């Protein structure tokens, strides 16, 4: 469980160069988080799946092939207070 704070959102958006105003803090509107922030949330959970002994290979020559996002139909995008 990680708390999505505004500072992390800002740092991430700057690191990716995203200008979409839904993520920069504006008064009178909920601070939104980029959908690509899930990997930041889920990396330390995702990559633990390539470690198990049964999947034994050259970790060094590993190549990231493809990634896919999919919001659950009817799910609310992330806010800056979500305990995720």
């Amino acid at each position: 469980e990680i708390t999505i704070s505004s500072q992390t959102i800002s740092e991430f958006t700057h690191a990716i160069g995203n200008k979409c105003d839904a993520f920069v803090d504006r008064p009178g509107k909920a601070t939104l988080a980029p959908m690509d922030f899930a990997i930041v949330i889920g990396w330390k959970a995702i990559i633990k799946a390539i470690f198990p002994k049964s999947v034994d290979g050259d970790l060094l020559k590993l190549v990231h092939l493809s990634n896919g996002y999919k919001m659950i139909t009817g799910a609310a995008p992330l806010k800056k207070g979500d305990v995720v």
Partner: protein, 85 residues
């Protein structure tokens, strides 16, 4: 006497304090250090974000400028621009 616009007014107040070249240099230092703080903070307070390309495409097809936080209107009195706003 002298005075300055939106931004350069700091240069005006420098001139009124400038006596020698070294005094001028020192005051210019205090100036550019000031306006650097202004540039930093007025962006960190309202960071300009991306803009929907339909918007600026239409605005440039309308002959207007690339949208920006400040708009200049000409040929119109104040009493009616305040009526439109």
């Amino acid at each position: 006497w002298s005075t300055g616009h939106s931004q350069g007014l700091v240069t005006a107040v420098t001139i009124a304090a400038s006596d020698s070249w070294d005094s001028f240099l020192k005051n210019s230092l205090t100036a550019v250090s000031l306006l650097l703080f202004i540039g930093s903070r007025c962006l960190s307070t309202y960071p300009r974000t991306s803009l929907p390309p339909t918007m600026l495409q239409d605005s440039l097809d309308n002959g207007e400028g690339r949208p920006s936080p400040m708009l200049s209107v000409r040929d119109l009195s104040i009493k009616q621009v305040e009526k439109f706003i």
